[PDB]
From a paper:
The anchor protein [name] does not contain any Rgp/Kgp processing sites and is in contrast to [name] and Mfa3 considered to begin its mature sequence at the lipidated cysteine (Cys29) directly following the signal peptide. The full mature form, ranging from residues 29–324 was expressed, purified and crystallized. The final [name] model consists of residues 40–320, and is built up from two β-sandwich domains (N- and C-domain) and measures 85 × 35 × 25 Å in size. Importantly, [name] is stabilised by two disulphide bonds, a feature not present in [name], Mfa3 or Mfa425. The first is formed between Cys54 and Cys285 and links the long β1β2-loop of the N-domain with a loop from the C-domain at the domain interface. The second disulphide is observed between Cys298 and Cys300, rigidifying the turn leading up to the penultimate and ultimate strands of the structure. In [name] the equivalent residues are Val44, Val46 and Phe48. In the regulatory protein [name], the C-terminus forms a final β-strand that following a β-hairpin runs antiparallel to the preceding strand. Whereas the Trps in [name] and Mfa3 are firmly anchored in similar pockets, the equivalent Trp of [name] (W315) is solvent exposed, due to the bend between the two last β-strands.
Author numbering: 40 to 274, 279 to 320
The structure:
């Protein structure tokens, strides 16, 4: 007698009043872990079109409590670790962003999604126990698009914006695995006479590890600015658990000190003045 959980995938961010069903999610990796956090089921679905009334069957066999972990748009940008049924556990590393040294592969134009379903339960069918069961899971986007401008700066082509974060590795549950920091590829436009703009696509932005935004004078290598992006943020208005796009302005000014060097004296994020210096 065959058994399983039907799962419906939605996206409702917490600031959203109605659930969404993002077209951005094109494929799925859905795992089932049991009472012990051991992998019991591993499934892959291509051609995903999330919908209000669409479901996906997650095969199970033995009665019990299960939680489902779901990943959207797992790509060949990622090094996938061991996945072994009856062995692999919830907190092992599923995934590492592919890197070249400490530089991330460029993931602009990609979305990455995670959901945890509630705990569900296959009950003894020999007694009063349904069919298959059903549940829903909320896909939260883990990718973040971060635009940064450094303003009022002579020779803006001589400066480089960098974004480091220890956020390229994830456990089976959606949590960030500990790792060395990862630099993300900052594609650049000198936009103004005194302005330089960089665009980063990074993964999850949360406290608990390095999330360093920095500005460096390339010819000398002199880092003129460094701050923890998440820290700056959580100093809102700017709620990381509902948002995924970050327009950041860094206002530079000559230091007036005997270093004849520039410094950052204002950091704006999504239109809020976060810190003056």
């Amino acid at each position: 007698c065959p058994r399983g959980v039907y799962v419906n995938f939605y996206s409702q961010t917490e600031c959203a009043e109605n659930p969404s069903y993002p077209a951005e999610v094109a494929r799925l990796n859905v795992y089932a872990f049991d009472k012990d956090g051991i992998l019991r089921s591993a499934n892959v679905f291509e051609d995903v079109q999330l919908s209000a009334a669409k479901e996906w069957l997650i095969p199970l066999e033995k009665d019990g409590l299960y939680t489902i972990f779901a990943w959207g748009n797992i790509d060949d940008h990622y090094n996938i670790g061991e996945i072994k049924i009856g062995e692999t556990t919830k907190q092992q590393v599923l995934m590492r962003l592919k890197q070249d040294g400490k530089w991330a592969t460029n993931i602009d134009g990609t979305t990455l999604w995670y959901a945890t379903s509630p705990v569900v339960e296959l009950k003894n069918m020999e007694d009063g126990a349904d069919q298959y069961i059903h549940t829903r899971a909320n896909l939260r986007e883990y990718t973040n698009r971060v635009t940064v401008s450094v303003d009022s700066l002579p020779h803006p082509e001589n400066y480089e914006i960098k974004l480091a974060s220890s956020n390229g590795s994830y456990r089976f549950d959606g949590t960030v695995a500990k790792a060395d920091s990862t630099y993300y590829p900052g594609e650049t436009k000198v936009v103004g006479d005194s302005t330089c703009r960089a665009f980063f696509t990074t993964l999850k932005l949360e406290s608990g590890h390095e999330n360093t935004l920095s500005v460096t004078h390339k010819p000398t290598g002199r880092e003129i600015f460094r701050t923890d992006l998440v820290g700056a943020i959580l100093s809102q208005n700017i709620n990381l658990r509902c948002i995924n796009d970050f327009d950041i302005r860094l206002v530079a000014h000559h230091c007036n000190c005997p270093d004849d060097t520039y410094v950052v004296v204002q950091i704006w994020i999504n239109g809020w003045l976060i810190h003056s210096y």
